Structure formats: structure tokens, C-alpha cells
Write a protein that binds this ligand. Structure first.
Ligand SMILES: Cc1cccc(Nc2cc(Cl)nc(SCC(=O)O)n2)c1C
Ligand SMILES: Cc1cccc(Nc2cc(Cl)nc(SCC(=O)O)n2)c1C
Length: 265
């Protein structure tokens, strides 16, 4: 039954991602460990002394703030790739795929999924970081020197339009499943089984949107377009990352993330 395929995907989403949209919009709105606001250099340094004490003692605050923010981004990406891999291992039919095709799907899918889910922790003024314990302002990131000021703003632009669709986690879980189970990734061995897998997920998504969002007549084709938008956003992101790896010393790539980008686009 498709009602339960959707429920299983949604339950695996709530289980595997440490931050979900309901939790995020609470923190983002107005407790015990409120988010420290990072809006200039002074507050970045204060936040680092509390949230990453070992690094400060290692002397990271001698490095350019842009380098520390980039490596903060990388650490968050590595953790999200780990969650996405477990989420996917929990997608019905994914674990039955060929080992090599699981790697291919995740390799090309993870950053599309990341930037989709990143919208959940963004508002027009900034984004949540450090497991809900920091809030870094969009204007502070815009204030960094090139090229680092170009990292986050295209993702804010995507997220504000994405958030206007007013999806909830039950929608987003299916959307991310669909991103991962994409039958036209380069390098796929058994394209036929993946397309049938994708067809079933997208079928559930289309049906779920019908019942969950009866007011938005074209929400399904809108989300198809967002999937294309995300692939272009990821292509452009990989280009900026390659610029940074080559031009900026100190901003070395984490080994897990380097393998993801290797031969990607
Ligand atoms: C927004 C925020 C919150 C918490 C810590 C930090 N700074 C970081 C975070 C990370 Cl994961 N790494 C670094 S420096 C790593 C290095 O110089 O090798 N600096 C930042 C930039
Ligand atoms: C969930 C979350 C919140 C904040 C930042 C990130 N990682 C990002 C986001 C953006 Cl727009 N850019 C980067 S550059 C480092 C990388 O390509 O992994 N890393 C992630 C994955």
C-alpha cells in the first residue's frame, strides 16, 4: 500500500535526521539552550569558544574567519551525508539495489538533498548551525570576502522560494527520497530497476501531495521543477568549491567530501 510506503519513508526521516522542520521552526521563532547569534567577528569568536573549544585551543582563531566557517560547513555536510546514507538504506527497495548503484545514487543525490533540507533551518535572516545552538546571519555571511561570501547566498535564495511552498516533513521526506532514487544519474548499472523504484516513490509523492496540499493545484510539477533547480544549484556549488580548494590554502577538502565531488560534474 502507498499510504504505508509514505509512512515508512516519513518515519525513517524523523528517525535519521537530527534536525527536522518542526524542531527548526521552534528554535528559529522564539529556551533551555537558545541559539547563539553569530552576526559579526566578535560573536563568531564567542560562539567558537563555547561550541568548538578544542579547535580554539588548537588556535583556529588565528585563521581567517572565512576558513573556519568553510570547515564548519564541511563538518556539517559530512554529518548530513551520514544521515542521508542511513535514510536511504531505509528507503524501500534501495537496499535491494546493486552495491555500486547505491553509491552512485547517494554520490549525485546527497547535495541536492542537503540543499533541499537546508531550507528547513533557514529564514530570511540566517540559518541554524551547530545542532540548533547557533544562528548565523545571512548578512554576516554576505560580508565575508570573496569567494566565501558566494557560498551560502544562492542557497538562501532557493530556500526562501522553497519555504514559500509550506511543505512539512511528511512532504519533504518523500521529496528527498525522490531526489535520491533518480534514474538518470551517470554511471548507473541497472537503470531499469531504479526507474521503477523512482516511479513508485514519485507516485507516492504525487498522491501524498494531493491529500496533504489540496489547495496547491500545481504543487507536484512545482516540485519537479525544484528538483531540476537543485541539480543546477549543486553543479554551480561544486564549481565554487573547486575554486576554493585550488585558490584558498587552509581550506582543504574533507576526504569524504572530496570523494563525493571527484568525477561528479
Ligand atoms: C558558525 C560556527 C559555529 C561553530 C564553530 C565555528 N568555527 C569552526 C567550525 C569548524 Cl567545524 N571548524 C573550524 S576551523 C577547522 C580548521 O581550521 O582546520 N571552525 C563556526 C564558524
Ligand atoms: C545542514 C547544513 C547546514 C549548514 C551548512 C551545511 N553544509 C554546507 C552548506 C553550504 Cl550552502 N555550503 C557548504 S560548502 C562545504 C561543502 O560543500 O560541503 N556546506 C549543511 C549540510
Amino acid at each position: 500500500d502507498l499510504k504505508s510506503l509514505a509512512k515508512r519513508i516519513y518515519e525513517a526521516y524523523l528517525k535519521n535526521f537530527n534536525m527536522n522542520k518542526v524542531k527548526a521552526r521552534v528554535i528559529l521563532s522564539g529556551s533551555n539552550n537558545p541559539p547563539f547569534v553569530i552576526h559579526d567577528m566578535e560573536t563568531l569568536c564567542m560562539a567558537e569558544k563555547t561550541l568548538v573549544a578544542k579547535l580554539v585551543a588548537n588556535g583556529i582563531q588565528n585563521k581567517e574567519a572565512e576558513v573556519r566557517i568553510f570547515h564548519c560547513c564541511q563538518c556539517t555536510s559530512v554529518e548530513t551525508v551520514t544521515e542521508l546514507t542511513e535514510f536511504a538504506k531505509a528507503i524501500p527497495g534501495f537496499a535491494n539495489l546493486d552495491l555500486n548503484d547505491q553509491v552512485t545514487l547517494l554520490k549525485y543525490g546527497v547535495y541536492e538533498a542537503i540543499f533541499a533540507m537546508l531550507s528547513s533551518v533557514m529564514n530570511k535572516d540566517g540559518m541554524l548551525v551547530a545542532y540548533g545552538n547557533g544562528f548565523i546571519t545571512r548578512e554576516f555571511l554576505k560580508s565575508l570576502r570573496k569567494p566565501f561570501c558566494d557560498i551560502m547566498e544562492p542557497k538562501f535564495d532557493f530556500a526562501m522560494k522553497f519555504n514559500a511552498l509550506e511543505l512539512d516533513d511528511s512532504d519533504i521526506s518523500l521529496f528527498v527520497a525522490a531526489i535520491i532514487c533518480c534514474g538518470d544519474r551517470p554511471g548507473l548499472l541497472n537503470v531499469g530497476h531504479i526507474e521503477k523504484m523512482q516511479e513508485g516513490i514519485v507516485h507516492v509523492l504525487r498522491l501524498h501531495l494531493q491529500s496533504n496540499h489540496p489547495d496547491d493545484i500545481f504543487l507536484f510539477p512545482k516540485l519537479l521543477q525544484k528538483m531540476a533547480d537543485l541539480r543546477q544549484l549543486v553543479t554551480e556549488h561544486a564549481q565554487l568549491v573547486q575554486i576554493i580548494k585550488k585558490t584558498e590554502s587552509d581550506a582543504a577538502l574533507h576526504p569524504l567530501l572530496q570523494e563525493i565531488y571527484r568525477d561528479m560534474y
